[PDB]
Design a protein around this ligand. Structure first.
Ligand SMILES: N=C(N)NCCC[C@H](NC(=O)[C@@H]1CCC/C1=C/[C@H](COP(=O)(O)O)NC=O)C(N)=O
Length: 146
């Protein structure tokens, strides 16, 4: 009957059905198939409207929300085609401190992370990746590892 968050959608360019998750922003052709804690890695792209417009990559972050989203889109594209792996992109490009640990955040339960991240994280199954997930930090790609 489809896991939490998943809905059937119709492709504009091909007419083929696909599946979309409105919690994680994941989308795929394939038909998809709770814990106390999950472990996730993430790649963060911050923007001018981030709660802290600063990171290890640059002192003053000034890119716009729309620009950050386009970077996130491009990374997802490289991950999905296997041009670059997630961990590699997070180490190089995530505006989070967890970049030094390949995006890994360790384990966490509900009530610890900003709500959109948390919900997305818990709706992923082990091994799955999110689409763009928006929080006050910026835009995330989430990978559930455990
Ligand atoms: N148990 C653990 N590890 N502590 C959870 C408490 C921190 C938590 N953080 C976040 O929710 C954002 C979203 C997902 C990752 C994340 C990372 C942020 C991003 O960097 P910032 O926007 O702050 O500059 N870094 C936090 O220092 C929060 N309640 O604000």
């Amino acid at each position: 009957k489809l896991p939490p968050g998943w809905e059937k959608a119709m492709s504009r360019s091909s007419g083929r059905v696909y599946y979309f998750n409105h919690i994680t922003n994941a989308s795929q052709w394939e038909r998809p198939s709770e814990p106390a804690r999950v472990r996730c890695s993430h790649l963060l792209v911050k923007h001018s409207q981030s709660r802290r417009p600063s990171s290890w990559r640059q002192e003053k972050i000034t890119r716009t929300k729309e620009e950050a989203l386009e970077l996130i889109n491009g990374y997802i594209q490289k991950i999905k085609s296997g041009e670059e792996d997630f961990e590699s992109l997070a180490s190089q490009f995530s505006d989070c401190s967890s970049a030094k640990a390949r995006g890994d955040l360790g384990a966490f339960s509900r009530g610890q992370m900003q709500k959109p991240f948390e919900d997305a994280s818990f709706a992923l199954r082990t091994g799955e990746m999110s689409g763009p997930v928006f929080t006050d930090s910026g835009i995330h790609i989430i990978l559930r590892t455990e």
